Scaffold this motif. Structure first.
Motif, short mmCIF file in Angstrom:
data_model
loop_
_atom_site.label_atom_id
_atom_site.label_comp_id
_atom_site.label_asym_id
_atom_site.label_seq_id
_atom_site.Cartn_x
_atom_site.Cartn_y
_atom_site.Cartn_z
N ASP A 35 0.85 -1.19 0.00
CA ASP A 35 0.00 0.00 0.00
C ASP A 35 0.89 1.24 0.00
OD1 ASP A 35 -1.92 1.94 0.28
OD2 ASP A 35 -2.53 1.34 2.30
N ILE A 122 -6.45 -11.37 2.48
CA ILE A 122 -5.47 -10.35 2.84
C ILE A 122 -5.11 -10.55 4.31
CG2 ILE A 122 -5.04 -7.87 3.10
CD1 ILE A 122 -6.98 -7.47 0.70
N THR A 222 -5.44 1.51 -3.26
CA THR A 222 -6.79 1.92 -3.63
C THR A 222 -7.12 1.30 -4.98
OG1 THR A 222 -6.79 3.98 -2.35
CG2 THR A 222 -8.23 3.89 -4.29
N1 LIG Z 1 -6.44 1.72 1.10
C1 LIG Z 1 -6.01 0.79 2.13
C2 LIG Z 1 -6.99 -0.38 2.19
C3 LIG Z 1 -6.68 -1.57 1.56
C4 LIG Z 1 -7.58 -2.62 1.61
C5 LIG Z 1 -8.79 -2.48 2.27
C6 LIG Z 1 -9.77 -3.65 2.32
F1 LIG Z 1 -10.33 -3.81 1.09
F2 LIG Z 1 -9.10 -4.79 2.67
F3 LIG Z 1 -10.75 -3.39 3.23
C7 LIG Z 1 -9.10 -1.29 2.90
C8 LIG Z 1 -8.20 -0.23 2.86
#
Ligand SMILES: NCc1ccc(C(F)(F)F)cc1
Ligand SMILES: NCc1ccc(C(F)(F)F)cc1
Length: 330
Positions: A35, A122, A222
């Protein structure tokens, strides 16, 4: 030294990309979301509230012989989409594609928002913005890139995201076989802690290029492309039946439409986003309305060149003392 790691889309829409990261001794491999819009390295862990873990791989500091608790340190982060997480801090050995950093701050989540729990693929985030945005208190911590900088052959990393396909994050070197033509470099402002730059304009489809300064951030974290309302209105005006839906929360278009490409300027160079990259599929299963990949930044307060834009290019994040961003076609 250098590092190279493959990054893989988490679903058929390229909603996010995960990259394997080795943490601890012996290695615990977690799939992290790289990120460039944030600066915390945080992971699901054995300390996370069990009800908030649903299939993620967890980091267990008690099984790592190099893990040390950072006494009294805490962290709390809130993302622009409303996501959040918080917990305590360990230091440990972290390796990305052969590149190893000792004493990296690994932020262990005790609580995560629902959007992370529901994203089983994730295991955490690896922040790559500037370290001034790191949320560790009372002692701010450095990013993986910052800690690795001195040992890298060149203080750069590159993002080569694939369209519906795997891609590559490289640390310390520029793969001159991964792009075509020349790399165009542009100035970065670090005043807000982001990889912030100014695009020189845009074109819709085969239309005339409009020279106009668009200030925004390069954010691998994003999914979509968030641009000023005037630009986004000009794009969707060329799609028959497209409209802004308040119930859906953005522009939608009939799934049978063909989308025009979108071009954005980098100095005197032009990056073309194929129209297919802007299709994010039906808003709900079975629907004939599809969600658009270019949306207005009016509610956000900042323009965001997310994955939709970045995956159309080979992107150099040059972390020299005067930082710059490089864009090349591929
Ligand atoms: N921009 C950072 C971010 C990355 C992934 C997520 C999610 F999709 F995993 F919720 C939220 C925020
Ligand atoms: N990918 C991290 C991130 C999340 C939100 C924002 C915003 F919305 F504040 F600009 C920037 C960066």
């Amino acid at each position: 030294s250098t590092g190279s790691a493959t990054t893989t889309p988490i679903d058929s829409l390229d909603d996010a990309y995960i990259t394997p990261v080795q943490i601890g001794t012996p290695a615990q491999t977690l799939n992290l979301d790289f990120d460039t819009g944030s600066s915390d390295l945080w992971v699901f862990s054995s300390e996370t509230t069990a009800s908030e873990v649903d299939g993620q791989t967890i980091y267990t500091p008690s099984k790592s012989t190099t893990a040390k608790l950072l006494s009294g340190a805490t962290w709390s982060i809130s993302y622009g989409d409303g996501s959040s997480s918080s917990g305590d801090v360990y230091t440990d050995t972290v390796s990305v594609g052969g590149l190893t950093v000792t004493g990296q701050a690994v932020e262990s989540a005790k609580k995560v928002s629902s959007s992370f729990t529901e994203d089983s693929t994730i295991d955490g985030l690896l922040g790559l913005a500037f370290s001034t945005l790191n949320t560790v208190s009372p002692t701010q911590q450095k990013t993986f890139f910052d800690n690795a900088k001195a040992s890298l052959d060149s203080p750069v990393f590159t993002a080569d995201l694939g369209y519906h396909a795997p891609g590559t994050y490289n640390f310390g070197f520029i793969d001159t076989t991964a792009y075509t033509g020349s790399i165009t470099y542009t100035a970065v402002s670090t005043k807000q802690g982001f990889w912030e730059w100014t695009s020189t304009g845009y074109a819709v489809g085969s239309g005339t290029f409009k020279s106009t300064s668009i200030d925004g951030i390069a954010d691998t974290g994003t999914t979509l492309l968030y641009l000023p309302a005037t630009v986004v209105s000009a794009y969707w005006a060329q799609v028959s039946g497209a409209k802004s839906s308040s119930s859906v929360g953005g522009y939608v278009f009939p799934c049978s439409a063909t989308l025009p490409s979108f071009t954005f300027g980098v100095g005197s160079a032009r990056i073309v986003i194929p129209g297919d990259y802007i299709d994010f599929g039906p808003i709900s299963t079975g629907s004939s309305s599809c969600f658009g990949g270019i949306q207005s930044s009016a509610g956000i307060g900042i323009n965001i060149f997310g994955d939709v834009a970045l995956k159309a290019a080979f992107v150099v994040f040059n972390g020299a003392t005067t930082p710059t961003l490089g864009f090349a076609s591929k």
